[PDB]
Amino acid sequence: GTVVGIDLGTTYSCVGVFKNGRVEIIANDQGNRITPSYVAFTPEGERLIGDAAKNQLTSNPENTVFDAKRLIGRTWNDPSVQQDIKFLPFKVVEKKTKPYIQVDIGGGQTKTFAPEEISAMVLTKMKETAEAYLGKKVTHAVVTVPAYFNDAQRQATKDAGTIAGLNVMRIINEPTAAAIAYGLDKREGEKNILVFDLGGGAFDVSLLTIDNGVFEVVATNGDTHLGGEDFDQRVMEHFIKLYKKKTGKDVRKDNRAVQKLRREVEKAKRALSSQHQARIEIESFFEGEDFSETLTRAKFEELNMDLFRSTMKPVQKVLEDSDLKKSDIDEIVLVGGSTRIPKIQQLVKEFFNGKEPSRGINPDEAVAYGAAVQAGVLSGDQDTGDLVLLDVCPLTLGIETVGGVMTKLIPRNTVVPTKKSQIFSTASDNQPTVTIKVYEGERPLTKDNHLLGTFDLTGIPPAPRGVPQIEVTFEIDVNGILRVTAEDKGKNKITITNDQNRLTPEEIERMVNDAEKF
């Protein structure tokens, strides 16, 4: 059928379709070309998704869910998850070592959701938006992820797609999608394009070469827990502390107070993109008292300056990894909602010695636009023109060798799909199982990198230590997701079992079925 492109964002999502020779970004039922990544359950049992969910946050905060993009593919004990919990009104509980979400779905009835199920609801809303515009069912999609997403975050996004009843044909890295929006139909030779992608929750920088519809990522780097949400938390914290100093009272555990502050902080941030001061006004803030304060642009900037400045380190790294200087950059493409912040634009400009970013790019839509073009290509639409993408893995994959040392299998910035094979053997006589832990990251020792998964090579026939010869192949697919397989080089196929913190097959089937009821 008609394959859609969905930008699944932390705070906002966007859907496009390639039709009649061009991309159309599809407006939702309220006329908005972006939709809040919010879900809510009214006290009466109505499920709200998008604008309606966000609009009732302050009256029903404990049963309004958002920020799921910063919870998927993470463990409960991740310090980033524990940071966000302080500013999230909904209950987050540990289940299967992961942050699950508990809400009241109506009439006092508790329900627990995996964060993938929240993202599935958002994807369902984006699918419905496209279906209303197209006048037909949508079964297939290209869905975006941050370039710096790890394996678990990628797989969790695909699982969200599955739970939404979508066949996710391709997971596309956000800056790659944005590069397509910039570069589609340009015949300007080969150019070095830097995409600076700072959204509601994640930060990516990618350097690409673009040449007449051929897009190649040379290097990428970022931080999947740096964006708008962090800047909002800094301002919320400022005003929580301001109230503490004024009254002596702590509002941090009052969800109504904190989320009313969130609403106002969002509006102020938007206003401060064009004004130098904004008013924070809350009628019934805490214990019958109102809240009435000013936020200057200078204060907003001061509260966030360390975070704003931290965005230049990934830019530095991508230039080094690509063997390019600042002066080799032909265009700077700014995408993501946080690139509307004047100070962010100034810092990027100053970092590039006064160079102006590319005009004609809406930072809220460019990623969706690119996703819709790639969806057009995967639908066989010739009006997209020749469109070739070469993308990379963001993180070095490795294994542990003697001394806790990170030993490389596949280095960062390798074009995918790619594979690496290695022979493994046993450490003791008659050992029936060999366990291999795979890590993601650039640090010297495995303990300072991220555990991707534990893989057990099982059914190894009895033999003396060191005699078995098992060739394990580690393959990263075009989506950026790892598959591990094994062959006895001495019955050829070796059964591998893995633990990668993924939703179980039973979970996914149950969650798919539950979603179909809505």
Author numbering: 28 to 517, 521 to 548
Manuscript excerpt for this entry:
The abundant Hsp70-type chaperone BiP (or Grp78) is a central component of the chaperone repertoire of the endoplasmic reticulum – the gateway to the secretory pathway of eukaryotic cells. Like other members of its family, BiP consists of an N-terminal nucleotide binding domain (NBD) and a C-terminal substrate binding domain (SBD), both of which are connected by a conserved hydrophobic linker.
To facilitate crystallization we deleted the N-terminal nine unstructured residues from mature Chinese hamster BiP as well as a large part of the flexible helical lid (SBDα) at the C-terminus, a deletion that favored crystallization of the ADP-bound G. kaustophilus DnaK. In the crystals BiP adopted a domain-docked conformation. Accordingly, the interdomain linker was well structured and bound to the NBD by parallel β-augmentation. This surprising feature extends to the fine details, as the NBD of nucleotide-free AMPylated BiP assumed a conformation that resembled the ATP-bound NBD of intact BiP and deviated considerably in structure from the isolated NBD, whether crystallized in the apo state or with ADP or ATP. Second, additional electron density extends from the T518 side chain hydroxyl group, consistent with the phosphodiester linkage to adenosine.
